[PDB]
Design a protein around this ligand. Structure first.
Ligand SMILES: Cn1cc(-n2ncc3cc(Cl)c([C@H]4CC[N@H+](C5COC5)CC4)cc32)cn1
Length: 258
């Protein structure tokens, strides 16, 4: 269970392994994949990444039919494991993670990359609980040479996906990632996801559009972050709040401490 000068010690999730260098004791994460055109694209995207709130790419090695993608280790594990079911987490902790998630998303959008699967399992934490956006297997280019390209592929994870993905032939990338961030903020503040999917047949989604916020999970959330969620989880992507306006929101700028 080794690759060149690295040993593969334990499974970090699915695969991704903890790679410990036998000589230096440096520890990184390595993604192992057994597709050739998909991995070439993913590597080009990974090589662009340079920000404190995004997992850094160290390089790749090919052994026969096996590809090894080496990346920055996030020793604090996932944000998912910090969310208490039915409770969430303390609001100051949720706001700090949300600021870091916005910093990472602004960075990605600034280089014309959309993640397309933002959710707590893909948001990792370093040793000082700094958030890192991970897994670029679904990531794509939405802006190149300053020209935006609409997306059409369905992907992501249904409870986090924006309604336009299900209803429109083509859609803008940025508002879809903004929406998934709103669902992550809901999960952090309530420890519960609001709907299986934001579709016409989902009653919990209809309830939200009718502003039935006396229901769960909304009733667990303070009015200030709920006011931000009312601006993010807006059905029409053209009326939905953009990141520059999230940065002007009252709760986003509210001082909080445990
Ligand atoms: C302690 N610890 C370190 C890590 N770690 N460090 C870096 C790193 C990079 C990636 Cl891509 C991954 C992935 C992230 C997507 N998940 C999927 C399963 O649900 C979603 C599998 C693992 C894990 C990584 C995780 N826990």
């Amino acid at each position: 269970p080794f690759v060149e000068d690295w040993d593969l010690v334990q499974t970090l999730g699915e695969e991704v392994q903890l790679a410990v260098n036998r000589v230096t004791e440096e520890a990184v994460a390595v993604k192992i994949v057994d597709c050739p055109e998909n991995i070439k694209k993913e590597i080009c995207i990974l090589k662009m990444l340079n920000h404190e709130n995004v997992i850094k790419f160290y390089g790749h090695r090919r052994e026969g039919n096996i590809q090894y993608l080496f990346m920055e280790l996030a020793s604090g594990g996932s944000l998912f494991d910090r969310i208490e079911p039915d409770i969430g987490m303390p609001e100051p902790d949720a706001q700090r993670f949300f600021h870091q998630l916005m910093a990472g998303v602004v960075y990605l959008h600034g280089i014309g990359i959309t993640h397309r699967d933002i959710k707590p399992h893909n948001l990792l934490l370093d040793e000082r609980d700094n958030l890192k956006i991970a897994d670029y297997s679904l990531a794509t280019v939405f802006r190149y040479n300053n020209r935006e390209r609409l997306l059409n592929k369905m992907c992501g994870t249904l409870p986090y996906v924006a309604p336009e993905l299900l209803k429109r032939r083509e859609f803008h990338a940025e508002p879809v990632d903004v929406w998934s961030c709103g669902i992550v903020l809901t999960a952090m503040l309530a420890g519960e996801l609001p709907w299986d999917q934001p579709s016409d047949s989902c009653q919990e989604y209809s309830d939200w559009k009718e502003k039935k916020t006396y229901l769960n999970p909304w009733k667990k959330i303070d009015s200030a972050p709920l006011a931000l969620l009312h601006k993010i989880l807006v059905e029409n992507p053209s009326a939905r709040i953009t990141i520059p306006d999230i940065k002007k929101d009252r709760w986003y700028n509210k001082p909080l401490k445990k």
